[PDB]
Ligand binder design. Sequence first.
Ligand SMILES: Nc1ncnc2c1ncn2[C@@H]1O[C@H](COP(=O)(O)OP(=O)(O)OP(=O)(O)O)[C@@H](O)[C@H]1O
Ligand SMILES: Nc1ncnc2c1ncn2[C@@H]1O[C@H](COP(=O)(O)OP(=O)(O)OP(=O)(O)O)[C@@H](O)[C@H]1O
Lengths: 297, 192, 205, 117, 470
Amino acid sequence: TKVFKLSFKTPVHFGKKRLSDGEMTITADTLFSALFIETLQLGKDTDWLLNDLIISDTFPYENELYYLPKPLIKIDSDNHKAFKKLKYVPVHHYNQYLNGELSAEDATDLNDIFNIGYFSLQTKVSLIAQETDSSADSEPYSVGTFTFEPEAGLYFIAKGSEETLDHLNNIMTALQYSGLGGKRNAGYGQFEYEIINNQQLSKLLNQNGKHSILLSTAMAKKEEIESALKEARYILTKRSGFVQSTNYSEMLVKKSDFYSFSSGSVFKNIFNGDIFNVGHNGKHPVYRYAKPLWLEV
Amino acid sequence: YSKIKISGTIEVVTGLHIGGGGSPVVRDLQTKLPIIPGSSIKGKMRNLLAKHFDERVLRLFGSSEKGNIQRARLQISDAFFSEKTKEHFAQNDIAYTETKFENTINRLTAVANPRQIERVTRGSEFDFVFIYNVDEESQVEDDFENIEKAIHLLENDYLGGGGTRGNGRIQFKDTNIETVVGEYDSTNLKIK
Amino acid sequence: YSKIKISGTIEVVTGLHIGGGGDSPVVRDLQTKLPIIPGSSIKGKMRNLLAKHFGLKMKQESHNQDDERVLRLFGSSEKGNIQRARLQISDAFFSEKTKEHFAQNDIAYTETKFENTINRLTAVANPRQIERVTRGSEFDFVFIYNVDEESQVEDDFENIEKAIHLLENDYLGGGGTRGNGRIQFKDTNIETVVGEYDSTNLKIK
Amino acid sequence: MTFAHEVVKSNVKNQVLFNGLTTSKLRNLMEQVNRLYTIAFNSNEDQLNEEFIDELEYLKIKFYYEAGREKSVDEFLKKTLMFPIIDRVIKKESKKFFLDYCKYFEALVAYAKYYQK
Amino acid sequence: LLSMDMSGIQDFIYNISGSKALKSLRSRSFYLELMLEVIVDQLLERLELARANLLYTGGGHAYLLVSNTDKVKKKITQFNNELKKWFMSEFTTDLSLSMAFEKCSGDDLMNTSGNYRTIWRNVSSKLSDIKAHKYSAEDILKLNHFHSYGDRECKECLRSDIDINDDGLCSICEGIINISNDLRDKSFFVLSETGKLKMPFNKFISVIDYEEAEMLVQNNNQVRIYSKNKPYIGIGISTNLWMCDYDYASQNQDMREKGIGSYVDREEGVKRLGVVRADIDNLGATFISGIPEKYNSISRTATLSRQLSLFFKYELNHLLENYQITAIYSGGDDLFLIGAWDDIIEASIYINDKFKEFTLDKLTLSAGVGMFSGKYPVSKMAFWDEFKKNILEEKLLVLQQGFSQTDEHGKAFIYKMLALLRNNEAINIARLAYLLARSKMNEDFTSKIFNWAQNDKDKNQLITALEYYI
Ligand SMILES: Nc1ncnc2c1ncn2[C@@H]1O[C@H](COP(=O)(O)OP(=O)(O)OP(=O)(O)O)[C@@H](O)[C@H]1O
Ligand SMILES: Nc1ncnc2c1ncn2[C@@H]1O[C@H](COP(=O)(O)OP(=O)(O)OP(=O)(O)O)[C@@H](O)[C@H]1O
């Protein structure tokens, strides 16, 4: 169980609905998708890295401090205002939060100190139209990009057998030169990675409790969802989009809509996910990653 | 399979004006140091190369819109000032970006309305990186010949705005070719 | 597809005052603290003179449209039948040989010759000082010409020769009618920098 | 530093300016400083040229000679302390401080110009 | 005590990027408002009950005081089930509604020991934690297995699940366009079974005038006329719906609604757009805490809520009449105005003062205004005393008078001013001293400007004012 540190140094576009939307972190779906496409391009085998590996979502970090998503636990006060405005809780204070030891003023201070990047829109045009030869409008369009301070970035949580971890490290060595976002070929999204161990993160990841904090985007398989939702606090997130090299027409190929729990849901009955298939009318199967990575407290 | 890295620096022979804000120039909203978007480089190379001849230009950048789909083979990345230029200008106390004043003459009227434009200082150096993904062995020599031709045309052309008016001329120096993934020799490939 | 490069030097016959900074200084490169001739000024004067040579009508005065040849050579891309410019002007920099001469002979790069103003009915004078590059200095320029078509090349170079010939009998900079800013061209070279078109038969005086 | 402004206000006596000093008495003065201003603004390095050192010496020559001609010029050149600052500029060999002195004298000139009969 | 919350307004209202964006936004806020109104009315019909039972509506909330009967509870649960079915059928993530209720007694309402606030918080808490669990098992399975042949995203409305039609528009957004076209001219909206826009209970909304509405009344048709702030109507089921629908673009020579460029093309300054968002900062306590220990009755809470609703739904319409601004989202505690950069700022200050009058300086406003270029996706366009007295009134007026009296000093001179001021160095200050010496203003203007630049607070105010000038 290692973590992988990511520093960017170039703006990255991550996207929700259009190109001119900017987003800070990315989900396990696009992460596994990038790993899988990099593997296929490299020509190695996918069986090893399909049904053994567990990937957690990407989360941001700052100078020396790491972050995790806000648990969706019922804190019984009544402000319900400063906490709603909080999105990430530093690791130093995680167990303090889950025991209701976080004060309103401390929450305000954390919100004040949480600057880890800013948003930008760069305007771009496209003269590929008749403009080159005849009177034709240049078509302006915008892309949403997000940048980090020189001491920031994203990090991973990965776990599995050591052989799978070695394969993952190889693939990431390959991948640091492809992208991890949107307009990869337009100049966005190259990174350097580094493997680090953290004593505090390790203790947090190997705790023992009664609840569970979901750190990835997963969906229970058909026969286990019924028992999964006995006592659950969760939010669903729709995940759609097109696919890369499935048929002749990109604009005719579009993945089937899929729904999965978010990255902060709390469950009482642990379930195992699966790599659901979201293909139809296609030559090769298309995958989406739904497999949980729990922390028990 | 393997990946080839093309790294080097570019100089502005005359001032450069990408000007995404426009009359400002593109910057980073915190560091305020000007950059060069990779979209500009990619678009100018693609236009010049296409106008130099539609399979090879399809092959390098990839269109994937015409019922047949081709993944891009050459990735451009953004640029930033070199540390050398920052040190040099700080030592010599030189402003990073100039502001030229201009006009325009109304015919039958001959009254000039002024104009203000912001221009990157001459002689700055930007750092650039290209990544090439060799997917067909028998094509690397032709592809690099084409990319050299594209660089050659770009050296004899302009980037950004008002190129016919006397800005945007650039130059390429200190270019090395290094293989970083895989086992393809990248010592017989040249880009001037 | 080919491109033709035009190189030469522009000698200031008398004091040139571009002076885009507005006392009343002159434009300078901030890398070398030197006065320069912006390319857009050269190209604008070539445009104006060559347009005035050919037909320039009232209705033509209105819109900044002009003769098809001038528009063809300099590009409009404004209404309907747009034409991409075939000719690119570059800036001019204070050459190295004049660096050496003014260093060896200790010659200032810019005079400050004072002028005055005698208004009428009061005859009271009003003084001013302006800056202009010193006589005899030279600047290096480069042109790039695109050939989007094969047959027209001779006519375009004829028009270019005409434009240069007119410009040599006019002024750049300001106060031209008042003496400043006369230039002459010399040491011209024409070479096909990219492509496969010969240029041995092409000349610009 | 505006202490020049303070001294000029202290020098408006019951009105006269420096007891008979006029801006045109300063002609040769600002002409010399502006001429040096040009020759120095042309330079690149802050390490002063040594014919520039000679030129600063020649400027000090003009200072004593102007002081010798007129008593009001002498009073002006003594109280507002052109003379130690020139000496320290000669001792320091720094260009930026030379321009600092230049805007100092220009501040004096402008303020006096607005401060007149 | 029954409470309803609308899930996804702030997202679904802000997926607009088209050229007709402004027309949709007025139509989209009105669409969500009318959804809430028709759903609450339909509920009250189920309860065989009166309209007076609706204590508060606005934003995505609603509050009702209904009978505490097992019959009432079963009807509420059943209607919740059908309601959730319908929204899952039409949007499936973008819009959802929540139901919640908690028992209360007469002793509670009469403000005995502040338990009114306790029950208010309890119902809020139950509403806010039932949103955690929105989907049963079988529903979530039902969603994930539809290999259904569908088209692609609506241009005006960002939705993958939706299917486009002619000109790349789906049905919902085209109906939105039509009703937006009808918004400015016609004042009455009808609840009819054929209509134009799809609505919860197998109903449709179209537009009517008072005369054909009258005929509908004498047609004894099961209709509910919804009006545009019109009293003294007396037409069938009179529903003076409270809404602020103002647009300066209709004050021009053409009555037809115009695009965003009608406000961009102003020549009095840069061709840009202004946007303002405002929330009452002290509102949660105001509805919850109220007047402590002596006036926390249900009656006085109702009065407070209604007065806030009337302010945020009528007074804004009259206040905006002198500004080139169009009202988009108004109601609840949210205020959204879009228009010229100068007019947005002036109207923001003026409405701030007027609100301070209406609440007698008891409630305050938190607001933020930005500048963006024209025709930018309005979706992404949207995602006090010192500023008035010192900046707008004193320094801005000084600078305007000085720049109007002395010519030749355009954006270049002010931009050199900016270069000297932003880079807070003493060398820039000395340069600015020389620049003001060279400038041809009255000596008072120059002295005041220089001395403002010498103070950090005064230099920031000065740069703000002069940036406003351009
Ligand atoms: N019809 C509307 N059009 C535009 N904005 C609206 C509309 N109705 C309400 N709003 C505003 O949008 C805000 C954001 O709505 P949001 O999606 O956050 O839901 P909410 O009603 O606040 O409840 P919750 O967030 O708890 O689900 C509301 O608080 C309200 O002020
Ligand atoms: N006219 C009104 N009558 C009754 N309740 C209202 C009215 N307008 C708004 N509200 C309610 O008051 C609540 C205020 O919560 P909200 O988070 O929207 O603002 P807030 O808590 O004041 O935010 P902030 O404190 O950050 O300004 C809302 O949930 C809304 O339902």
